[PDB]
């Protein structure tokens, strides 16, 4: 009876195994654009992905992760609200069964069709497993996906999904450039939060980009053909793998832009 996104094990149940689900800095949240505070002290983001080395793509039973070599400062995030250097370890998406839902964060209650999370860890803690135990351990760049024109830089991901249809499958996935997934503008909101899946640790500085990327209906349809289940188990489509918005509590969302 593992956690998941179903009727009997979904987000409303997670607090029984993970009591931090009811904590003070849980994610995602609704971003109220009119009460977000413009902070002129916030620096521009510095995304240095030119030397990124992707390794593999994996269906882990709740999403698919594209994993990167994080043994050196090859793909790093700096600047913005961050102190120090954060190394990219993996990216994954959350998506819906329908185009009108799928994102985890919302903007003035608006849901997008999907949300991309680029997960980075603070190099001062030496490895990802130690970083998640620290309040400043991770930085997650969140990018919204809306349905419209196709995103050419996403197609290489879409075309490999047939190889990792079921939980536990992996495929080699080298030479993928994550720069093809970024919007034109790097304006952002930021707030302190958590992982949005168990163990729900409160270790994330969230950086949510204002500008969505567009993907085609055909691209997102292919996400919805993945399976939560392993091979030979009954088929359950991997859809609606998003956590609903959590209370903001004593937190202020800051904006890098007016």
- Residue ranges for the known binding site for substrate are 196-197
CB of 117 to Zn ion, least distance (A): 4
Q: Which residues are annotated as a binding site?
A: 92, 94, 117, 196-197
Residue 60 vs 229, nearer CB to Zn ion: 60
Residue 138 vs 255, nearer CB to Zn ion: 138
Residue 117 vs 120, nearer CB to Zn ion: 117
Does 99 sit behind a cis peptide bond, omega within 30 degrees of 0 on the bond before it?
Answer: no
CB of 100 to Zn ion, least distance (A): 19
Does residue 62 interact with Zn ion by CB under 5 A? Answer: no
Does 199 sit behind a cis peptide bond, omega within 30 degrees of 0 on the bond before it?
Answer: yes
Under rule CB under 5 A, which residues in 189-228 are in contact with Zn ion? none
Under rule CB under 5 A, which residues in 72-131 are in contact with Zn ion? 117
CB of 115 to Zn ion, least distance (A): 7
Q: Which residues are catalytic?
A: 62
Q: Which residues pair with 157 in a beta bridge?
A: none
Residue 64 vs 176, nearer CB to Zn ion: 64
Residue 65 vs 256, nearer CB to Zn ion: 65
DSSP assignment of the chain equals ----SSTTTSGGGGGGT-GGGGSSS-S--EE-TTTSEE-TTPPPEEEE-TT--EEEEEE-SSSEEEEE--SSSSSEEEETT--S-EEEEEEEEEE-SSTT---SSEETTBPPSEEEEEEEEEGGGSSHHHHTTSTTSEEEEEEEEEESS--GGGHHHHHHGGGG-STT-EEE--S--GGGG--S---EEEEEE--SSTT--S-EEEEEESSPEEE-HHHHHHHTT-BSSPTTSPP-B-----PPP----S---EES--
CB of 112 to Zn ion, least distance (A): 13
Q: Which residue number is nearest to Zn ion in terms of Cβ?
A: 117
Under rule CB under 5 A, which residues in 230-249 are in contact with Zn ion? none
Q: x-or-dash pattern for Zn ion, window 11-50, by CB under 5 A?
A: ----------------------------------------
Q: How far from the centroid of its chain's Cα atoms is residue 230's Cα?
A: 23
CB of 94 to Zn ion, least distance (A): 6
- Residues of this chain that bind Zn ion (CB under 5 A): 117
């Amino acid at each position: 009876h593992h956690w998941g996104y179903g009727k009997h094990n979904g987000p409303e149940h997670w607090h029984k195994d993970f009591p931090i689900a009811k904590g003070e800095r849980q994610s995602p949240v609704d971003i109220d654009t009119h009460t977000a505070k413009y902070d002129p002290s916030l620096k521009p983001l510095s995304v240095s992905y030119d030397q990124a080395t992707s390794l593999r793509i994996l269906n882990n039973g709740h999403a698919f992760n594209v994993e990167f070599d994080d043994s050196q400062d090859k793909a790093v995030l700096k600047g913005g609200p961050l102190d120090g250097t954060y190394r990219l370890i993996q990216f994954h998406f959350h998506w819906g069964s329908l185009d009108g839902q799928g994102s985890e964060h919302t903007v003035d209650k608006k849901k997008y069709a999907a949300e991309l999370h680029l997960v980075h860890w603070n190099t001062k803690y030496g490895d990802f497993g130690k970083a998640v135990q620290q309040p400043d351990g991770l930085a997650v760049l969140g990018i919204f996906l809306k349905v419209g024109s196709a995103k050419p830089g996403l197609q290489k991901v879409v075309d490999v999904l047939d190889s990792i249809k079921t939980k536990g499958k992996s495929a080699d996935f080298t030479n993928f450039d994550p720069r093809g997934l970024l919007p034109e503008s790097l304006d952002y909101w930021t707030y302190p939060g958590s992982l949005t899946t168990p163990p729900l640790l409160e270790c994330v500085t969230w950086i949510v980009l204002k500008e969505p990327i567009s993907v085609s209906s055909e691209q997102v349809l292919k996400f919805r053909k993945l399976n939560f289940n392993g091979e030979g188990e009954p088929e359950e489509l991997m859809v609606d793998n998003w956590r609903p918005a959590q209370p903001l509590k004593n937190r202020q969302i800051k904006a890098s832009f007016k």
